[PDB]
């Protein structure tokens, strides 16, 4: 679903963004 993709992008982004930086720290 595209409509749900917008709101889901943030959730998936905050999940990878946190793990993406953690690997560095």
């Amino acid at each position: 679903q595209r409509s749900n993709f917008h709101p889901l992008a943030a959730s998936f982004i905050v999940r990878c963004a946190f793990e993406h930086s953690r690997r560095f720290t």
Side-chain angles (χ1 to χ4, degrees):
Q1 313 297 131
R2 317 147 87 177
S3 194
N4 298 116
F5 189 47
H6 266 116
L8 172 148
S11 295
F12 278 54
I13 279 296
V14 179
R15 112 179 289 199
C16 300
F18 203 71
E19 164 145 313
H20 185 292
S21 306
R22 208 186 61 78
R23 156 151 99 170
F24 194 106
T25 199

